[PDB]
Ligand binder design. Structure first.
Ligand SMILES: [Mg+2]
Ligand SMILES: [Mg+2]
Ligand SMILES: [Mg+2]
Ligand SMILES: [Mg+2]
Ligand SMILES: [Mg+2]
Ligand SMILES: [Mg+2]
Ligand SMILES: [Mg+2]
Lengths: 33, 130, 221, 258, 181
RNA sequence: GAAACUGCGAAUGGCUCAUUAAAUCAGUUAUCGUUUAUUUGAUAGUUUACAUGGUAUAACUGUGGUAAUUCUAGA
């Protein structure tokens, strides 16, 4: 449960949300930055 | 507050370092010690304090800002390898070598030039003679 | 030669043979207590080192690698989603065996494993094979610093994947048999140290299986 | 004096080096080498006063002893090695390659080149002569002796030398309509096309050169270097393409770009 | 040895220091602009003489002569920038018509007086030499500072000055401490 | 790594203007009239060898001379 792993879990959960709302996922990640 | 800006930044892989001009705005303060700027530059550029060198600070006429030249080496070993000995001594990375005044060293050089060989034979000869 | 440079000269700069640098070199990353850039992070370890290496290394090969990958490493979710292309480019550029770009690539390969370690497991076999070829290539062009990069890259991967590799060490050892069995003594010596760190991190039960396998192998170098 | 000199005062140094007159008392004396003293740029001035990589001579020595600097594909370690016209300076760590070419003002200019163009150089054939054992050879402007030349190569021609092998890849005859570069005199750095060669037996030959702007100038033949056919230079030229611009037009352009 | 550093004199004694009219004019100029000595007037006269001699020499040349065009344009640009020469008077003829008083006008002492920061030209000089006046973000302590057209609008009290928002000077806080005690 | 042999440098640098009136020097020529350490590039199958001597010594050990010197004698 190192801090780096915690960011992953948020990141993995964040990616899951992006999949659920949806190429499209790729473009949205670009829009984030 | 004090604000440090880096300008004219050049990346020199030959010496394995980064050159730049440091401009420090320090309102309501006489000036900033080299140690504090070394700490801040190390923090901003993400390096060891030992790998940061700074010099040439001249507060402009009227005060409030200082301008000088700053170096950030890639790692501490390179900093020790390339940095001048005197600047290392300033930062405490190296110890000043103690040596006699130039006149004494030159006089000793001349006196040794006078003698030929190890000189032990001369010592024994003078001891026997007297 | 026996009477090594035990008494050190006053000279600041002194020649060192390639063998000499190899002898004093030791693969044990933990001992190095110097500040590491990736220790301070905002988004991911990969990004932090990546920006730093853009600044320090100006080699042509690394520059091309950076441009291809700059867009896909801005955020950690970006890295995880595009992991397949990221690993391919890293392996693709490392294959060229260019010294002037090797250092940033080997570091970023380790930090790549740090960001997605359990996910690195599907990449794990390809990584070691890439490193083995690199080290085997490094024998031809004598550069002690290259070996330092490669083995440290091996150690860092070995550090981050400690839990999962420890479960399947005999598999991990199998990959490193060519290195451990290699003719040159120093390559076997270095690979032994990197692998040794897992051995210390073993459960005793897993160790006995590992010890059985190597003794079975035991029945060049 | 009772022998060769080993010091060079700053004021007596070549003007085009652009040395500060109050920084010190002495200037780098270029050691003996491929190029003449007054027509050479020592590596110290190039690394310190042009590229600004090194801050002082000691750092330049530190760079050179690391074997990072290559001249013409060979590592040099002398701080005062006389690099000059058409010599390729490679700094691998920076991934940089430079070719030393005079700009319009008459000074060596920092010109960055690609690796492929860095693979060769151009040399003016200063001499063509039979050596020992009946072996013809050519001596170029940089002191390179190349054996077994193409027989058609004559004096004042240009030879494209591959640095890896030190052999002639191709050659250009000195003829009317050829593109040439001025390497001496007040017209130093200009580029043009040959119009006519005046011959004076027992004297200095003169060459008329017409620039792209149709301006014409006459120069001694020793100061001309053939670099290719019109519109097709064999090397990349620095900015301005060797065109001399009047002071008024320079003012106008400077104000416009600013 | 090290190469020479050039030096020059910025003033010259007039051809006739003893002319009564010249003495009266020097008196008038010094009083109006608060000049310390005759050396300042001689200095400004020397400069104006140099510019006017150059303007004469350029006028002597034929019109459209490239040297004439370039040097005249540069001189007119400099004079317009420093504020001596107005925008509408960009001809070498009007350069030749300049007077000393125009140069004395641009001096930072006179400008500081005119903008209202000081009650006298002498008060302006005292303020300047006491580090109270700043052009832009910069403190200037030289009355002979020549103000450009752009810089005229940025003259103000310096931030560090007690009149510019800093703490009271030594006298003020000394008296305040004594009163408090 | 002292000492010494060997190689290189000490002919550069710094100072002064005594002599010097077609001399120096300035500009401009010539070496088809010659030397050139060094740097740079070429260049030598044709000359007991698993490698020859003291035809030799320094430093060093030891014995000494002179009031004295960057003096040196014998072994
Ligand atoms: Mg001739
Ligand atoms: Mg104050
Ligand atoms: Mg006489
Ligand atoms: Mg004569
Ligand atoms: Mg030598
Ligand atoms: Mg040679
Ligand atoms: Mg004997």
């Amino acid at each position: 449960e190192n801090p780096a792993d915690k960011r992953r879990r948020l990141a993995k959960q964040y990616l899951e949300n992006l999949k659920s709302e949806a190429d499209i996922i790729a473009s949205r990640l670009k829009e984030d930055v | 507050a004090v604000t440090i800006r880096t300008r004219k930044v050049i990346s020199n892989p030959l010496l394995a370092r980064k050159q730049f001009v440091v401009d420090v705005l320090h309102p309501n303060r006489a000036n900033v010690s080299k140690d504090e700027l070394r700490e801040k530059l190390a923090e901003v550029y993400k390096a060891e304090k030992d790998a940061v060198s700074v010099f040439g600070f001249r507060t402009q006429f009227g005060g409030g800002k200082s301008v000088g030249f700053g170096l950030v080496y890639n790692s501490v070993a390179e900093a020790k390898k390339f940095e001048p000995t005197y600047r290392l001594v300033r930062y405490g990375l190296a110890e000043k070598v103690e040596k006699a005044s130039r006149q004494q060293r030159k006089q000793k050089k001349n006196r040794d030039k006078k003698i030929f060989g190890t000189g032990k034979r001369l010592a024994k000869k003078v001891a026997r003679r007297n | 030669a026996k009477q090594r440079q035990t008494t050190k000269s006053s000279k600041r700069y002194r020649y060192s043979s390639f063998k000499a640098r190899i002898d004093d070199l030791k693969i044990e990353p933990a001992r190095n207590l110097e500040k590491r850039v990736h220790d301070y992070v905002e988004s991911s370890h990969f990004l932090a080192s990546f920006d730093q290496w853009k600044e320090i290394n100006l080699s042509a090969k690394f520059t091309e690698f950076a441009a291809e990958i700059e867009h896909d490493v801005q955020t950690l979710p970006q890295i995880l989603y595009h992991d397949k292309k990221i690993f391919n480019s890293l392996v693709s550029f490392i294959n060229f065996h260019d010294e002037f770009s090797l250092q940033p690539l080997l570091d970023l390969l380790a930090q790549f494993c740090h960001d997605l370690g359990p996910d690195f497991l599907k990449f794990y076999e390809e990584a070691i094979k890439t490193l083995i070829n690199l080290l085997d290539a490094a024998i031809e062009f004598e550069s002690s610093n290259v070996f330092e990069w490669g083995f440290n890259c091996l150690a860092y991967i070995f550090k981050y994947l400690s839990k999962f590799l420890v479960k399947k060490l005999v598999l991990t050892c199998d990959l490193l048999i060519p290195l451990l069995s290699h003719s040159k003594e120093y390559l076997s010596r270095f690979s032994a140290e990197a692998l040794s760190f897992l051995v210390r991190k073993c459960p005793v039960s897993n160790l006995r299986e590992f010890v059985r396998s190597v003794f079975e192998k035991l029945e060049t170098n | 004096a009772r022998g060769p000199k080993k010091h060079l005062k700053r004021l007596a140094a070549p003007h085009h080096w652009l040395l500060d007159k109050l920084s010190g008392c002495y200037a780098p004396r270029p050691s003996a080498g491929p190029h003449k003293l007054r027509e050479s740029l020592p590596l110290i001035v190039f690394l310190r006063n042009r590229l600004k990589y090194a801050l002082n001579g000691r750092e330049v020595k530190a760079i050179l002893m690391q074997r990072h600097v290559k001249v013409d594909g060979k590592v040099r370690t002398d701080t005062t090695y006389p690099a000059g016209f058409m010599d390729v300076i490679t700094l691998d760590a920076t991934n940089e390659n430079f070719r030393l070419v005079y700009d319009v003002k008459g000074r060596f200019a920092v010109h960055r080149i690609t690796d492929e163009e860095a693979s060769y150089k151009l040399g003016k054939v200063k001499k063509v002569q039979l050596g020992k054992k009946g072996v013809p050879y050519v001596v170029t402007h940089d002191g390179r002796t190349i054996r077994y030349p193409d027989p058609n190569i004559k004096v004042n021609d240009t030879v494209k030398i591959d640095l890896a092998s030190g052999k002639i890849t191709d050659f250009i005859k000195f003829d009317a309509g050829k593109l040439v570069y001025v390497t001496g005199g007040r017209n130093l750095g200009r580029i043009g096309t040959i119009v006519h060669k005046e011959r004076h037996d027992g004297g200095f030959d003169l060459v008329h050169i017409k620039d792209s702007l149709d301006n014409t100038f006459v120069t001694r033949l020793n100061n001309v270097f053939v670099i290719g056919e019109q519109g097709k230079p064999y090397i990349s030229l620095p900015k301005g393409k060797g065109i001399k611009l009047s002071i008024a037009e320079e003012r106008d352009r400077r104000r416009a770009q600013q | 040895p090290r190469a020479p550093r050039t030096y020059s004199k910025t003033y010259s004694t007039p051809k006739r220091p003893y002319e009564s009219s010249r003495l009266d004019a020097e008196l008038k100029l010094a009083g109006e602009f608060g000049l310390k000595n005759k050396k300042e007037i001689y200095r400004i006269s020397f400069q104006l003489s140099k510019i006017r001699r150059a303007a004469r020499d350029l006028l002597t040349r034929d019109e459209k002569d490239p040297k004439r065009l370039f040097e005249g344009n540069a001189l007119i640009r400099r004079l317009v920038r420093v504020g001596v020469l107005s925008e509408d008077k960009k001809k070498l003829d009007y350069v030749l018509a300049l007077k000393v008083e125009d140069f004395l006008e641009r001096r930072l002492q006179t400008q500081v007086y005119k903008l209202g920061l000081a009650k006298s030209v002498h008060h302006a000089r005292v303020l300047i030499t006491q580090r109270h006046i700043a052009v832009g973000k910069q403190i200037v302590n030289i009355p002979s500072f020549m103000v450009r057209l752009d810089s005229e609008k940025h003259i103000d009290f310096a931030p560090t000055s007690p009149f510019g928002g800093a703490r009271p000077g030594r006298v003020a806080r000394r008296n305040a401490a004594r009163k408090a005690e």
